[PDB]
Amino acid sequence: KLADYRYGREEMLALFLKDNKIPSDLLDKEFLPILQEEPLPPLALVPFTEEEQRNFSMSVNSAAVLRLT
Amino acid sequence: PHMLEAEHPLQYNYTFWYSRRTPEQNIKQIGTFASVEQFWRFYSHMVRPGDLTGHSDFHLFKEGIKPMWEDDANKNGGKWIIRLRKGLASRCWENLILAMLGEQFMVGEEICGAVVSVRFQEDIISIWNKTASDQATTARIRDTLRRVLNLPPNTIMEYKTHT
Numbered sequence: 001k002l003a004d005y006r007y008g009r010e011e012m013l014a015l016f017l018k019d020n021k022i023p024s025d026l027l028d029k030e031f032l033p034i035l036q037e038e039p040l041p042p043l044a045l046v047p048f049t050e051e052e053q054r055n056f057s058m059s060v061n062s063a064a065v066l067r068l069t
Numbered sequence: 070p071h072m073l074e075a076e077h078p079l080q081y082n083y084t085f086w087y088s089r090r091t092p093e094q095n096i097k098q099i100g101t102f103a104s105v106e107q108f109w110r111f112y113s114h115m116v117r118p119g120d121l122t123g124h125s126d127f128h129l130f131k132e133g134i135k136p137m138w139e140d141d142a143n144k145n146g147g148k149w150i151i152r153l154r155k156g157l158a159s160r161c162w163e164n165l166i167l168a169m170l171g172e173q174f175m176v177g178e179e180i181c182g183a184v185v186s187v188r189f190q191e192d193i194i195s196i197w198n199k200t201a202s203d204q205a206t207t208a209r210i211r212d213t214l215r216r217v218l219n220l221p222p223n224t225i226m227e228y229k230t231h232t
Contacts, residue, residue: 001177005080007105012167015077015105022114025100034087034121039113043163055157061225062191065152069225 013044070132076104080172082132083182085111090124101132108170112163118185118192119159129166130182130197138231142181147201147230149210151194151218158185158192161218165194168217175213179206194218201230 007015018039026035048056070082085099099115102108118127128136137143153161162185168174169183181197196214198206207228214220 003080003172003175005078005172007077007171008173009164009167009171012105012171016109016113017106019110019113021110023100023110026111026114028099030097031087031099033089034116034125034127036114036116040117041113043117043160044167051156052160055154056160056219056221058221060151060153060157060220062152062154064191065225 009044013042016042070101070103070107072103072107076106078104079108079170083108083129083170084132084134085115086128086130086136088126088128089121094124094126096126096128096136105170112166117159118162118187119156121187124188126184126186127162128182128184129169131180134181136182136184142199143197144231145201146181146197146199147207147228148184148195148197149207149214150227150229151214151220151224152227153192153194155190155192158187158194161185161194164218165196165214168213169196173213173217174210176206176209179203179210201228201232 020039082101082103084101086096087099088094088096102111130136134140134142165183169180174180179198181199183196186193198210
């Protein structure tokens with residue numbers, strides 16, 4: 001099966017827009033622990049730190065899962 | 070999930086869910102969206118996974134698919150599991166859901182959804198597919214995760230089923 005609606009990474013990001021209007025669904029009280037009031041840009045626009053670069057380049061697995069192997 | 074003509078539809082409607090184990094892992098539906106613009110309205114107003122406190126999880130499944138193992142679409146399905154060191158899950162979650170929503174996995178309708186689980190000393194990224202016995206789809210998804218999450222070659226991944 002082939003997809004009719006396809007968006008590459010840059011396309012998804014191109015379509016991001018800061019909208020301070022919070023979806024009503026997220027204004028439920030039971031989602032206060034996870035509500036981000038001020039909209040955040042995609043992490044894709046945030047450059048890696050030196051640590052992030054090292055980890056994503058060499059080792060990403062937790063010590064716990066490596067403890068089994 | 071009303072949809073406007075100006076915004077960009079997704080191949081499927083998707084539903085965000087949220088669960089926290091409180092001294093209890095009961096999954097709660099946040100809401101459903103249908104376009105790329107609608108997705109960003111939810112995601113950009115959700116705390117990042119890495120900033121969640123305690124035994125917490127985000128789920129992102131196709132509308133109508135329940136993120137539990139009692140759902141029929143999941144009785145014969147499986148999931149790829151990546152157990153990550155702390156500090157990586159937020160970026161992997163974003164890259165994963167962007168590729169899933171973008172239909173970059175190229176496996177028809179086999180995808181059910183994605184989950185990021187925040188734990189004490191590790192984070193767990195997973196993606197569920199319809200048919201676990203589908204070794205053809207299970208392999209494509211694995212190779213796609215590798216490229217889409219930019220996993221180092223020796224990254225450990227596990228495919229779990231219910232049998």
